[PDB]
Amino acid sequence: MEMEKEFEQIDKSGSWAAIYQDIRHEASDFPSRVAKLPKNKNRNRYRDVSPFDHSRIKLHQEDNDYINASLIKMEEAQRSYILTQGPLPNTVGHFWEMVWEQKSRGVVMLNRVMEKGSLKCAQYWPQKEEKEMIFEDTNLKLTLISEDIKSYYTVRQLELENLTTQETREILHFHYTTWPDFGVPESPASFLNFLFKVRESGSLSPEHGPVVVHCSAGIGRSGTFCLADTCLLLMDKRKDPSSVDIKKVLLEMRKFRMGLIQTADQLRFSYLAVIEGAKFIM
Numbered sequence: 001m002e003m004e005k006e007f008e009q010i011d012k013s014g015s016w017a018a019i020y021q022d023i024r025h026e027a028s029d030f031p032s033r034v035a036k037l038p039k040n041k042n043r044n045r046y047r048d049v050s051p052f053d054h055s056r057i058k059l060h061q062e063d064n065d066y067i068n069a070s071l072i073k074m075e076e077a078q079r080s081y082i083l084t085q086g087p088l089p090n091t092v093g094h095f096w097e098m099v100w101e102q103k104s105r106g107v108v109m110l111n112r113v114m115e116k117g118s119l120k121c122a123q124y125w126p127q128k129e130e131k132e133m134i135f136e137d138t139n140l141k142l143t144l145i146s147e148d149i150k151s152y153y154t155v156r157q158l159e160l161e162n163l164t165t166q167e168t169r170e171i172l173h174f175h176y177t178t179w180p181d182f183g184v185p186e187s188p189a190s191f192l193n194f195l196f197k198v199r200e201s202g203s204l205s206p207e208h209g210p211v212v213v214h215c216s217a218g219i220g221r222s223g224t225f226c227l228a229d230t231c232l233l234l235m236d237k238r239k240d241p242s243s244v245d246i247k248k249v250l251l252e253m254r255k256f257r258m259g260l261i262q263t264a265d266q267l268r269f270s271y272l273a274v275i276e277g278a279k280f281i282m
């Protein structure tokens, strides 16, 4: 079926939970043996969210190459994304090592450091220009260059220096700051505006490594971001845009990381975002 009328049909019939459970039943199951090794317990935020072995990002290190991060490679859309958990106190150096080694231009953050009164990720970037951060375990230096605070999101320019080689690179930090503590946004307008700002920066384009996107676990809000982006790109590429099937795209993405889209409300919000977005593109 088309999307917008499939949407109203699920609303009128109140069957979002059944649609979402079907997706959960059909989703791929691949091994995640490296994630579960005892030496990696303090590298995982949640025991039930792990990268598959076949798609995990490897650190370029011989001691321990493990990070909780997955490469999502969308062949028809010609887009790739790295989805990862919010960094932990003992993985902030690994996080920036990955950014460096994978040649990423942008980092997309969809959570606040504290939500619901608890810490959802480490404070992994510097908040003042004159107070830079040094990651001694991976030999990197990170400096805040500029910060632009808007009503729904903040954009930061950062400099990452590899202290071994003295090479430097400019990284863009796109921080969506207004996702509510509970539920999903009432309108997709600010989330779509944010997606378009990431696109306009070059951070999603083939001349760079894959964008790094995270929330707390790296599957819920993060899944919503890449699902909406890929569906809108396919609608521009194909002769028949109404052939784009959001459930099929989601199942393809779940071949590369488990659990993408965590609730039936997140599924409905993803439909809404693609529907509204497709009208603005034209």
Ligand SMILES: CCNC(=O)Nc1cc(C)on1
Pocket: 196, 236, 280, 281, 282
């Ligand atoms: C339908 C032909 N035009 C476009 O698709 N325009 C755009 C704008 C953005 C953004 O994506 N497509």
